[PDB]
Write a protein that binds this ligand. Structure first.
Ligand SMILES: OC[C@@]1(O)OC[C@@H](O)[C@@H](O)[C@@H]1O
Ligand SMILES: OC[C@@]1(O)OC[C@@H](O)[C@@H](O)[C@@H]1O
Ligand SMILES: OC[C@@]1(O)OC[C@@H](O)[C@@H](O)[C@@H]1O
Ligand SMILES: OC[C@@]1(O)OC[C@@H](O)[C@@H](O)[C@@H]1O
Ligand SMILES: OC[C@@]1(O)OC[C@@H](O)[C@@H](O)[C@@H]1O
Ligand SMILES: OC[C@@]1(O)OC[C@@H](O)[C@@H](O)[C@@H]1O
Lengths: 91, 91, 91
């Protein structure tokens, strides 16, 4: 057994918070935006996770780097669902 | 034996930096703000750590997600000491 | 065998993205800035990695915290190559 691994990001004034947790090979997402926490749409395989986000005006963009073994898959939020990104690692 | 795990955040112009380190089940905090590094008030159990921070005007708010096993505790800095937050994980 | 560990940061409008990956004791860096991913100059030992970045005007500053065992080395980007920073951990 082992500890889960998390990554977090935030934006805005309230603020909006996203916390990604890698738990036994699966990454899920929890969301805060002023009231209580709730579960987000992100759900992808991964043993390790990192995240970064940026704003274009008021629109949030999120990149989640999910790693299983030596394979890191980037997942992209740009307002309309999660999609796989072009990220590949060195060599 | 194993490697420590860290998380970092920063704000401002100098800037101010916070680095959280999980070392053998305990998370401590180091701080930079223009001169040298010094130890911060955050000290809580955890094998894994992540962090995010945001500003309201000039006031910094920090959220540290500390995980021991499958249990993740959120710790909140809002100007006046660290307090436990409402975060819980999916299901 | 084990999974790689990553950290990510971003800045700007395009945006610019940096992803650091600790893979079998070595951390390398991948970069995005509007077209495709390419390999960055950062290459240092480490089993765990975290990152934070900030802007001074339009100039990016990056701090990468590389941990091997209980030893965490800070690496600094301030526009002109990576250099070791003053970071040390508690006690
Ligand atoms: O409001 C929740 C949500 O839509 O915010 C953007 C992303 O975090 C999504 O995965 C998530 O479902
Ligand atoms: O819109 C998707 C995308 O282009 O966004 C910027 C980078 O995250 C890329 O890897 C990714 O494919
Ligand atoms: O100046 C250090 C400090 O007060 O900054 C806010 C938090 O990082 C605290 O834990 C820490 O003691
Ligand atoms: O002020 C504390 C709090 O409400 O801040 C926003 C979120 O981090 C919540 O989980 C947390 O309880
Ligand atoms: O454009 C790539 C680059 O110069 O950007 C700043 C740092 O990420 C460097 O390691 C990297 O080579
Ligand atoms: O310019 C280097 C430096 O002073 O930048 C701020 C902190 O990251 C310090 O540890 C580091 O030595």
């Amino acid at each position: 057994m082992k500890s889960v691994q998390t990554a977090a990001t935030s934006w805005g004034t309230v603020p909006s918070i996203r916390v990604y947790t890698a738990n036994n090979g699966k990454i899920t997402e929890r969301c805060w935006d002023g009231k209580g926490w709730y579960t987000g749409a992100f759900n992808e395989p991964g043993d390790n996770v990192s995240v970064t986000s940026w704003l274009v005006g008021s629109a949030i963009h999120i990149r989640v780097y999910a790693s299983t073994g030596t394979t890191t898959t980037e997942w992209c939020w740009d307002g309309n669902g999660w999609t796989k990104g072009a990220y590949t690692a060195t060599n």
